[PDB]
Amino acid sequence: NLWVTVYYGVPVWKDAETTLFCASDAHNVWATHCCVPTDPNPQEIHLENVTEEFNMWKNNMVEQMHTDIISLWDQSLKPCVKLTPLCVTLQCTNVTNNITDDMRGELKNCSFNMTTELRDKKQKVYSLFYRLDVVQINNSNKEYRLINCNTSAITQACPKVSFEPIPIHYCAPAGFAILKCKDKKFNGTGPCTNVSTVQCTHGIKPVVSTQLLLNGSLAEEEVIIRSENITNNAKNILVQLNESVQINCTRPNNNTVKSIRIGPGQWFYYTGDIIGDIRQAHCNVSKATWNETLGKVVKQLRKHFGNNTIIRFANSSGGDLEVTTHSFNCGGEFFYCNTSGLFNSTWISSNDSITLPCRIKQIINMWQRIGQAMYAPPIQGVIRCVSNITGLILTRDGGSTNSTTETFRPGGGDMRDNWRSELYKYKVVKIEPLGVAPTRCKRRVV
Amino acid sequence: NLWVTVYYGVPVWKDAETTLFCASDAHNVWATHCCVPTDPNPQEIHLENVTEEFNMWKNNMVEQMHTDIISLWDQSLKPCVKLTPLCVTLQCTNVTNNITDDMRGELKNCSFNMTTELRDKKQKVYSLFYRLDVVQINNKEYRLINCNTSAITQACPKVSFEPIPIHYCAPAGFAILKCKDKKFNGTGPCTNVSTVQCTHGIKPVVSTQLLLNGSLAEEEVIIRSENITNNAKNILVQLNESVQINCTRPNNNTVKSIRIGPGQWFYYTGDIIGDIRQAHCNVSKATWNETLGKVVKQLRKHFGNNTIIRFANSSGGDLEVTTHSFNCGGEFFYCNTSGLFNSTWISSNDSITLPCRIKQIINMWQRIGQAMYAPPIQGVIRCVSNITGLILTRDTNSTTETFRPGGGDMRDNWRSELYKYKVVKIEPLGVAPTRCKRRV
Amino acid sequence: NLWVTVYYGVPVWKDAETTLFCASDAHNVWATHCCVPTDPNPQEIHLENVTEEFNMWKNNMVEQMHTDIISLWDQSLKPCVKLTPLCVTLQCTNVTNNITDDMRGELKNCSFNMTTELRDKKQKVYSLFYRLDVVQINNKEYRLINCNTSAITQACPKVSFEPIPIHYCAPAGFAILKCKDKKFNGTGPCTNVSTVQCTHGIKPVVSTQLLLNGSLAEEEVIIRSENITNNAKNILVQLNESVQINCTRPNNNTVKSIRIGPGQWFYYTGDIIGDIRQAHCNVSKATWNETLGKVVKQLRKHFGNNTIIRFANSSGGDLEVTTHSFNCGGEFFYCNTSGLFNSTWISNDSITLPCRIKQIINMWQRIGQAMYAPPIQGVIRCVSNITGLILTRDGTNSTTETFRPGGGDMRDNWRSELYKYKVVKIEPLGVAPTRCKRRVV
């Protein structure tokens, strides 16, 4: 004795994939792009008697971060000076004045022919290189070419443009909603009961780095390790710390940047002169802090691998610097730090900071993509920055020896895996307001 | 007595034009762009007791097909390397190595300066050229034929341009109607019609003089044109059976490549292994003769019982209209047709060999402000195509008329596959007199 | 006692901004990009007992016009041949051939090399051109004036830039209101108003110093400024009579061209046929003096019956700032207006204004791009209608004030033509009290 009753405005949803847009709270690329203002009201609604399943490894928002970040990057670089006319035979010599023994021939003094405003005139330019950007022509030790002359055209970045990451808030389009998990112990891939609605995410700062994750959210309560298919050594491990570690980085030398005209309406920037004893770049971390932090990580993985294990750390496998070193941007310059000193220990059940030497590059490929190149003009003076280590990417060697000793190394990964961390908290669903139910009424018919 | 009653959802329509969306059945250019999948649904509704009028010569879909094709073609070339750095003087001499009399001076061995990965370096290379794309400057000084008129872009070697069937689908609010009358000539009323969701899969085949790989008539031979009497119209002939044509370029080419810049590779024709002979195409003489005899009987139905049909080659014009053209294996062929149109029809077997020329610098789509270079293909090329129709023109009660093959808009080829389809817009509102009055 | 009654279809609006679509009637760039036809049916609704607040200096229709015109200009140059490869060292000497009007040093005979169709070939070529387009490097070396600053693009010779009337039309949901008060001063509660779907056509004429080919005022000359006592604001003078100005580029010319690449044509000046003569514009002095008379009367109405109005020339600055400027025959003219502002007022005679021609044009007061004006063959003549002025009071209490042809940005030409018009958004929903309660079953 029941009929169909129809309702519109039913508070339900289904998992869905849509396009999100960004906003911020105000030269910067991020600011230019995410020009849409934010709403100061958190608009977060706790739901009672709610459960939801959050699988961060299937979170499409991670892909969106990647897609749109790259897109912005490309748009920002596009309207700038092409350095194509300069990928020419270069004459070089090694620098022998005010050089420490750590540097030796890493820094080179080169000279070459350059164009001028009139096509009929040519000038001669002198500049400095860090070796990593320059290779031998074919082997003569006077003649060199830029590393990219056989692969891609290089565009210099416009010096007025700021890439400093800012927190960015992502907001749902009408018809969609964002759900958030606040379960402090949630490890991803699964149900969460501390569920609330979200209109816009918190501000996520798009920091790009490799082996160590800087300036992200810090874990609440305890160090937590998140991974999928954990016994499979093909997967990496994302570790989120609940205490930050301070790292002090520097580019110690005084760089006098010079610029010249290259063609109508266009300037070229280069290194000019360097003042003071020349040293490589460095990053400092307290050794005690690092050891305490690491021990905490070890305890968490120990519960995952067994009470009787030995946790051994080792440095990374060989390969490109973007894989083997801690690659990050500091002060606008690109650093490649040797992290092997952070992994030389085995764990068995004043600060004396560990200092990592770091290389600097002027020719930058980007996003693990090739066929494009960017030239990073030098920055005048001396550079320092201080960053917060909030998490790590690690891999396990795997294999079966059953020795109880597991080996962990700096992990490699995608930029997507950095963003994956912040986004573990959010899911996108579509609102479905229409539905039916049984009833004792029947439409009145007259 | 009667009042106006409004009816919504009335199954009626009007003639309309709208953009269609391109879909494929599923890294070919056609497929990459026309990536929208088709439905596994041969959806058709027979419009019982409905008559509709079709006019293929006014069909908007042909124009859209053309426009979208041009656009896609250019989009494909937009990211490819320019060959403008190669607009230099060539130092050319005749090739005499294993070359027969039907070739002689067609091939040239040219040397020239070109750029390198580094701006300051230059290199000297040797390359083999076809006479059709190289012009004497005045001696030994030659240039690429188009470096005076337009930029030349190299087509990307990785891209496949072979046609795939494409289905055109209506946007909501629109429908495609189809004529199922097997005897329909493209312009009259059609009394056997049905609705269509998407057209059949039509391959974007490009050719001149003879139509290739299209649909065949059930009803023997149909000859149609916008107006037969009008001597300015180009007549399309649809056949019920195909004629197979076997085309080849017998020479084994050795392909090499050199960089002219950081990501810029130029592909050169290199040299030839073995004997050098002309490219050519073969058809059966009888098959061709049987086909024409039927065409003639059909022509008499429009031109007279005592009419004598004289076949001849085209009257003149550039290579693009005087030769048959196609792109077999990706190489561009310009084949002679005089061997096909010599006879006069009155009231294990031998084949016809058509000599062919090869060209690499192509002015595509009947345009002149663009040119492209077709990278050479390594090895020897062979294919067989289906001739499914003819493109014909004709020249004081002589009783004898002359018909010739010829060129025309590429649109005219596409008109054939689209001849049976029409686009209409759906119009859901209408009113009618009834005996009810709105309750007041 | 009263309930709520809800109404939809309520004839009300609020001020709002939107984008208005560009249309025209009847190779011309304005027509090409405003292909949308106008409605041949005129339309207007008077609104009796409606008074509206207008402010011509807060009118966003002006800003839209500005943005769209610049975009149009750039879009039209995008597909044209670049002249970048021609930034070569020039060897130049002075031309005295058939020198007349003592215009010495104005033109130079420059020889230079250029790259032709093949990369292997260079050619020595010659051209004749104005000093305003060239600088010395320091039979001396010279370069084009804009080769250090930016790329130079040749405008396409087939494109006409002649202004045509452009009509702006509201999108559905919007309406344009207009002020019909002949004496409206640019701001305030205009009482004679009506609703208009599309504006009248406005010709997008761009000029400096004086306003050419605009609308004339009714009644009398109307002078308008945002702030009257702030000398930083210029005052627009809309005349109720048009002054004829006859402009010419008196020389006859041979135009030459050369290929500089694959289908890439460059056009240049060739040579001069006959005597070399100064460019100029003619105005009847008497009508000019009558016009000034009307203007000084209107100025005194704001400053006092006994004040003295001193006219004077423009301040020092760039030609685009200090001289009169217009496009006639495709050539760019820079004219000396000091002869128009010499008198002091208190209670044939054709003046000839000398002019100069420049081929490399920066435009819209923007820096970093330049457009090369193709040479025009033959002799150029046009007559324009002077419909207004842009003046500054120049800031003693001596009662004598100086009025200079300060000029202004391009928006002022548009502020003047689009002053009549305002944009609002339609808002059909509203409420009022009634006597009934909704009938309840």
Add this chain to the structure above:
Amino acid sequence: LGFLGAAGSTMGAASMTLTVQARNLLSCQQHLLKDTHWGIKQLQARVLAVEHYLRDQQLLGIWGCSGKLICCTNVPWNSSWSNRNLSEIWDNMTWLQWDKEISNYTQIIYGLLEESQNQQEKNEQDLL
């Protein structure tokens, strides 16, 4: 049975298929977005379909027919538009045939429907 299946049916016979016709009116993007023209061209087409849909709905509202597939009015039928018998109109003729025959008069009819509804709503408000 299907969209336009009733097109050859008589006007009366086709009345029960009005619902199929209504349902069908509103019925590799990572690649396609990159093609500016493909993207814009197809988006515009979708927008236009929406605009047409809404205009018809707007009219049904105006005429007081928004809640019905079949809506009776107070506007009389004019012999000027058609003087044909109802039995032929409904039982012999199809909608395609019939509609073509009155294509002149449609605007007249619409204006009448709009005014009739206008007066009826006023009457209701004055009564309440």
Add this chain to the structure above:
Amino acid sequence: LGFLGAAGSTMGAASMTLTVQARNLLSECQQHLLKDTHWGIKQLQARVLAVEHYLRDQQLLGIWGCSGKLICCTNVPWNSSWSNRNLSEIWDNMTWLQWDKEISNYTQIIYGLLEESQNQQEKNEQDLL
């Protein structure tokens, strides 16, 4: 009188023109839509916004239980906290522009009241069935 034929009409006088105003919203060359990317986009955006505007108002009338009617009498009383304007002037001295300006401060309040009253009545009808 035409679209917005008058706006000097009293509110009462203007009631028979509601059907006119109601018809304004949604009321080779074409190659230019793609040739000029920004031009085509700006126009498309404007059309979209007009539609969005239309739909929001229609949804709201539906919510309040007025729907397709141009004039509705509701179950929400006119409040005493609102300016105490005389009913004779409200309908025949005042025009809609003047009136709306006088009562614009309260718009969001009256809308909330209208929404709630309708929601309650609908629930009551379900209980009655």
Add this chain to the structure above:
Amino acid sequence: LGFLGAAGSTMGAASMTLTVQARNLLSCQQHLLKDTHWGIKQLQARVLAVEHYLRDQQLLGIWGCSGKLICCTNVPWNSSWSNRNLSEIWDNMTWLQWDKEISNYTQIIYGLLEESQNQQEKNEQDLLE
């Protein structure tokens, strides 16, 4: 409660929250225009939201519910869809749980709703004539 505040509520408990859910379905500049891909993506998103909205409204019209949030029809409830107590459903099941309970019947119910309404309108037409 707010938007989706009622999501964890039971079916009857969520009565009268229908209105918030309905209200929330509908809702620098030089960058938004210059970045063509950006602008297209955002415009498409708004267009899609509209298309979605319209499909739901169309169905409510087709089924004879139209502008109502709460409707009751002439179509019977089937044992092939569910066999649960009416109070179990209305007092204890969450609307989200309910959708999980009724799965792949949507198209059946809709077909029934569509046909029933079609016949009902025909019956009214015959009675008036």
